[PDB]
Symmetry: D2
Subunit: 385 residues, 4 copies
C-alpha cells in the first residue's frame, strides 16, 4: 500500500505543521519550515502541498521578505517535483477577523478581507494552483442579534461576485471552492453544510466558477452522512476539491488522520469517489495529535495515505465480486437506475397497473435483502470473504 505522486495525495502546510496549541494548552512541537515539510512529504509519496497565505509568508512581512519566502518555497517544489494544486486565505487568525472577513459588521474589515484574498489569488496562480478554497470560519455569530443573516448573505454574495469579476478580468484559470463547517470557532457558522453552500452558489453572478470543498469531519459535526453529501455535490457537478480526515461524532473538530473516526463512512466515501471517477486532489486536512513528536507527525501523515489505499482496494474488490453484483440485483439497485416514467405523464396517468390494479400487498411483502448486501460489504472491508 505505497503511495506515489500519481495517487494525487496532498497535504496543507498547517496540517503536519500544527504545533499543537488547543483551547486548553500550549504548543507541544516546534514550528516547521515549509521547505522541510515539502521535502518530508515528497519522501512519503505525496503529490503536493497547499497553503494559506499566512502559512507561507508571516503576516506583516515586507515585500522583500515576501519574495524571499516565495523563492525558497519554489526551490523546494523544484527540488522535489511537488505541486501546489490549491491555495486559500487566512481570514480567521488575526484579531481583526474576530467578527468575520467577508461578513464582518465593520465595512472597513470587509474591504480589507477582499484585498488580502486578491493578493493571495495572484500568488496562487503564479504557483500553479487550479482551485482557490474559501473557508469562512469567522462568518457567523454567538447570539441572535449580532448578525442579520439576510444582510450577511448579501455581503457574502457581494464578496464572491467581486472575486469572480477579478479572476475573469485577469483571465485566470482558477475556480473557487467554498468549504462549509457548521460551528467552531463561531457558535454557528454561515453556510454550515454542503447543501447550504450548493444552494448559495446558485445565487452568484457566475455560478460556474464556484463549487464546494466538503470536509469529512465538518459534515459529521452535524451528524450528517458524508458520502450522501458528496453524492449530492457530484450530482450537481460541483465537487471541485475534497478534504479528508476523521471525526468521532458530534463534538469539537478533531481532524484525526483519515480512516480514524467513522471507518465504514470512510469505506463508502472511497467507494463513491473511485466509482464516480473524481479526479481532483485527495487532500488531507488533519492534525497529528499533540501527544506526538515529529516521528509521530510523519507516521500520522503516512497512515492518511495508507488508509485511503487499503479502502480503495477493499471497495474495488466489493464492486468486482460476482456475488455482490448478484446481491445488488437482488436488492433492485439496477431498478433504481431506470427512469420511473420514461413513458411520460399521460401514459403514467392511463396505466392501471400503477394504481387501480397495483397489488400493494404483494409489493409490500418483497424483502429488500439489504442486510445480506451490507454483510458482504462488511466481509469485504474486513478481508473476511
Amino acid at each position: 500500500y505505497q503511495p506515489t505522486p500519481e495517487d494525487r495525495f496532498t497535504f496543507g502546510l498547517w496540517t503536519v505543521g500544527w504545533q499543537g496549541r488547543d483551547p486548553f494548552g500550549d504548543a507541544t512541537r516546534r514550528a516547521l519550515d515549509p521547505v522541510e515539510s515539502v521535502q518530508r512529504l515528497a519522501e512519503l509519496g505525496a503529490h503536493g502541498v497547499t497553503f494559506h497565505d499566512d502559512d507561507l509568508i508571516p503576516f506583516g512581512s515586507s515585500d522583500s521578505e515576501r519574495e524571499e519566502h516565495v523563492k525558497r518555497f519554489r526551490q523546494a517544489l523544484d527540488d522535489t517535483g511537488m505541486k501546489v494544486p490549491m491555495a486559500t486565505t487566512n481570514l480567521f487568525t488575526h484579531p481583526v477577523f474576530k467578527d468575520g472577513g467577508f461578513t464582518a459588521n465593520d465595512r472597513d474589515v470587509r474591504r480589507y478581507a477582499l484585498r488580502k484574498t486578491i493578493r493571495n489569488i495572484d500568488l496562487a496562480v503564479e504557483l500553479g494552483a487550479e482551485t482557490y478554497v474559501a473557508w469562512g470560519g469567522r462568518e457567523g455569530a454567538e447570539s441572535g442579534g449580532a448578525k442579520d443573516v439576510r444582510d450577511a448573505l448579501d455581503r457574502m454574495k457581494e464578496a464572491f461576485d467581486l472575486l469572480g469579476e477579478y479572476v475573469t478580468s485577469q483571465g485566470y484559470d482558477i475556480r473557487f471552492a467554498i468549504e462549509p463547517k457548521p460551528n467552531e470557532p463561531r457558535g454557528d457558522i454561515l453556510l454550515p453544510t454542503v447543501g447550504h453552500a450548493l444552494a448559495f452558489i446558485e445565487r452568484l453572478e457566475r455560478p460556474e466558477l464556484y463549487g464546494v470543498n466538503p470536509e469529512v469531519g465538518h459534515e459529521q459535526m452535524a451528524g450528517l452522512n458524508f458520502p450522501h453529501g458528496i453524492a449530492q455535490a457530484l450530482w450537481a457537478g460541483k465537487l471541485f476539491h475534497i478534504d479528508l480526515n476523521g471525526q468521532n461524532g458530534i463534538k469539537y473538530d478533531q481532524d484525526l488522520r483519515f480512516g480514524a473516526g467513522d471507518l465504514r463512512a470512510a469505506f463508502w466515501l472511497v467507494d463513491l469517489l473511485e466509482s464516480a471517477g473524481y479526479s481532483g486532489p485527495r487532500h488531507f486536512d488533519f492534525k497529528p495529535p499533540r501527544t506526538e513528536d515529529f516521528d509521530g507527525v510523519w507516521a500520522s501523515a503516512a497512515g492518511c495515505m495508507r488508509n485511503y489505499l487499503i479502502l480503495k482496494e477493499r471497495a474495488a474488490a466489493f464492486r468486482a465480486d460476482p456475488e455482490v453484483q448478484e446481491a445488488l440485483r437482488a436488492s433492485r439497485l439496477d431498478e433504481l437506475a431506470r427512469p420511473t416514467a420514461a413513458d411520460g405523464l399521460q401514459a403514467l396517468l392511463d396505466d392501471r397497473s400503477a394504481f387501480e390494479e397495483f397489488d400493494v400487498d404483494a409489493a409490500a411483502a418483497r424483502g429488500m435483502a439489504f442486510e445480506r448486501l451490507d454483510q458482504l460489504a462488511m466481509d469485504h472491508l474486513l478481508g473476511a470473504r
Copy 2:
C-alpha cells in the same frame, strides 16, 4: 394573548389526532374524527387545518366512502369558517413504502407513489390549498450499498418534474414545498436539511414552482441554528410554508408544542418571521405527549398559539426599544447592511485605505458590544426591562 383566525394559525389533523403510539408503546388515546378536530380547533382560534390523504380518507376506501368522508369534512369547514391552506400525501406509513416512495428501488412502487400523490393534488385544489408539502420520510437508507444516491436524486428530480408538469397542464395554482429531515425513520434521509432542499430545487425543470417547508425540530436534530436556515430560505425567496414545534437538541424527533425546546431560538425565529413579513400560515406540526388525555391535547394546541403571540409581543418590544436601536448601531448592524464595495472592483483595488494604509490593530481593538445587545434581548424576552 388570544389568537384569532387573522393570526393564520394552522394545525395538521395528525397532530391533535396523534393517538400516542411510539416505538415502545401502544396508543393512549382514542382516534378523533376529523370533524371534531375541525370544531375544537376553530373554538381555540385557529385559522385552518391541513391533512395527509390517509388522515382524511382511510387507506383503501372505495370511491363511495371517499366522497362521504370529503362531504362531512367540507360540512365542518363550512360550519366553522376553517380553511385548508396546505395538504400533503402519506408516502411513509404503508409497508409498500418501506424503501421510499419516489426513490424506492422498486420501479413499480415509484409509479404507485406518483399516482397516489396526483390523486391527492386534485383533492387539495378542490379544498382550496395553495401549498402542497412533500416530506420524503422513507427516502434514504440504513446502509451504504442499499441506495446509490446519484441515481436516487435522478429519481427524486424525475418525480418532482412530473408533478410540476401535471399542475401546469391542469392550470392549477398550487406550489410545492419540500420538507427536509436529517434522519428518522430512515437511518439517513435524503435532502436532510433546508440547504440540501434549496440546492436540489435549483436543478428542477421549473424551479419557481418549488420552495421549502422547514420544521424547527428537524433542523435542530442536526444541531443547526433554525433562524439562520430560515433567513437563508427567505434570502432565496423560497419560504413557502413553515412547521412550528419544539425539540430538545439532537435526539429522536420529539414534536413538542411550539415554545418548548429551545426557547431563545423560538424568540429569534418569531423576530425574523415578523420582521421579514412572512405572510404564510403559521402551521404547528407537534404531538401532544402521550401522557395526556383529551383535555391535555387541547391545552397543548392552545399553548402553541399562546407562545407564538407572547414571543411576537417580546420581539416587537425589543426592536422598538430606542436603547436596543442604539445598541444595534453600537454593534454596527447598520454597517452590515451597506455594500462592501458599491464603488466597484477597480476602485477597491486602488483604495490604499483598504490595504496598504489600513490600520489593522485599531480595527482589531474595537469591541463588537454583542454581549450588551444580547442581554437587552434577554431582558426583553423575560419582561425584565
Copy 3:
C-alpha cells in the same frame, strides 16, 4: 467464523421477533411464534434466548393460557438445548405505564409495576435465568415540573430494595442488572448512562445484588465512548450482562446488528471483553430493519455473531503481535500499570526528583507514539498487516 453454543451468543425474542412498527409506519412482517424463533436461532448456533414477560405470555392471559405458553416454550428449549440466561419485565408498552412503572407519579401504578415484576422473577428462576434486567424506559419526563427527580430516585431505590428483599426471602440465586438509556421514549430517562446506574446502585440496601447491563447504542446516543464505560463497569466489578448492537451516532435508537455503526468501537469493545475475561452472555438486542423479510431477519441475526467472531480474531492477533507489544512499551502502557507512589505519601513529598529537580521540558518533549500504535490497530482490524 461459525458460532457454536460455547460462544454464549444470546438473542431477545423481541429482536428477531420485531414486526417493524416504527413511529411512522405499520408492521412489515408477521409475528413469529417464540417456538419458531428458538428453533431458528438454535440452527444458527446461538446458545440461548431471553424474554420480557409479555413477549412469552400475551398481556392479560389467564392462568391456563399462561401455563400453556410456558409448556410449549419449555418443549422447544428441551428440543434444542437452548438456555434462558436472562429475563426482564415489560414496564413500557401498556398505556398504564405512560408515566413510568417504578417512578410513575400514581402510587397505584407503582405497586402494580412491582407485582408484575415479581411474578416474572418467579418465572425466570423456574426457567433457569441467572440475571434479571431492568430497563426503565418510561421513567423520566418531557417537562421539568412533571417529575421531582429526588422523589423519583427515592421511589426507584424503594422498588429495587423491595425486589432485593423478595429474592433474598425466596433464597433465589438471581442478580439484577439495570440497563441505562439517556432518552427515547421519554424526553429524558432517569439513570441515563452506565455512570448514573453505577452511582445509584451504591445507595441500595444490598448493592452486591445489582450490576449494569449497558447497551452499545444507548451510551452512543449520548456521544460517549462505549469501551470506556464498560472498562469502568468492569473496574467496579458490576458488568453482569451486556447488550450488543450498532448505532450511527447521536439520533434515535437504531438497534442495527452488531458490527454496524461504529466499527472501531466494536473492535475495542471485543478487545476489552476478551482481555478482561468477561464470561457472561454475549446478548444481541438489535432489530432487523423493517426493509427485510424473514430471510433478511436470519441473515441479520447471523451477521451479529459473525462480526463478533471476526473482531475477536482481529483483536487477539493485535495483542499477540510482538511488534504491537513493542509499540505498547514505546507508548508506556506498561508504566500506566505501575503504582504512581507505592513508596507512600511521605516518600513522595521528600522526593526532589518528583518536583524540585524534575525536568519538565525533557518529559514534555517525549512523544507518546500513539499514532503508530493506532495504525497497527487499524492494519490488524483490516487484515492489512
Copy 4:
C-alpha cells in the same frame, strides 16, 4: 436585580481574564492583573473569586516571586472584602501534561502532577478555600490502544487517595470536588459525566471527602438534562460546588454567560438549587466572547448574575402560585413523594388491589395533565401570567 455579596456569586480569574485565544485565533484582549479583576468584580457585586495555581502565580516563578504575587492578591481581597471559596490546579496547559496529570502513562509525570497539586492545596487553605476542584481535562485518549482504562482508574483512585491522606494528615478542613467533562481537549475524557464521577467516588478510601462540581455546559455536551444530574448529585449528598454557564447543544464547550444557551434548563436548575437549599457558591465558569473589549467583559460577567436573580424570582413566583400548587396535585406530584409500599413486601404481595383486582384500563385513561403544568411554568418564566 442587583447582586450583593450575600448572593454568593463567584468567578474564576481565568473567566473575565480569558484573552480570547481559540483553536483558530490569536488573543483579542490584553492580560488582566488578578488585582484588577478582584476590584472590578467586587464593584459588580460578586462575593469572591477562584483560581488555578498558574492563574495567580506564573508557572516557573521563584519562591520570591511567588510570595509577592500572593501578597498583592491578599491585599486586594483585604481591600474589597472578596473571599476565595474554591481553588484548583492547572494540570492541562503545560506540554508535560499532554497525556494527563494523574493518569499520564509516564509515572514521573504522575508524581509531578501530585506534587504540583499538594503545593496548591496548602495555598488554598491559607487563603481560606473550603473546596478544592479537580478537572482532569487531559485524562483520556484519542485512540483505543493509548489508554487501558482499568489501569487509568487505578491510577486516578491512587492519586485521589493520596490527596485525601495528605489533607487528613495536615488536619485541613477542605473537601475535594471532581468536575466531569465528556470530551475536549481529549477525544474522550475519563469520568465524562456527573454519574461516572459519583460512581468513582464510592471506590475511594474515604468517600466522604469527595463530591462533584458539575458544569452546565459539560453535561449538555453529552445531550444530558443538567437539572436531572444535579438532582442525582443532591440525592447522593455530593453537590459540593457548581459551575454555571450556557451552551447551545452538543458541540465544542462554548462557556457562554449563564442564562444564554438553554434558557428553560437554566430556569429549572435555579428552581432546584433554591428549592433544595443549596448553600454553596454560585460560581460562573464562562468566557466573554472574543468579539468583546473590556467593557463587554464586565457586561457579560454582570449578565451572569442578573440572569440568575431573574430566574430565581420567576421560579419562586411559580412555586408560590396557588394555581401551580393545584396543577402539581392534579399531576400527582404529591403522590410521587409518598412511599410506594411503606406497608412492606408481604403486605404488597397479599394486596389484591395491586394486581389481581387492579383496573389497568381505568388507571391508563387518567391524563397526567403535564402540558397544562408546563404552560404555567412557561407563563411564569416569561412574566406572562
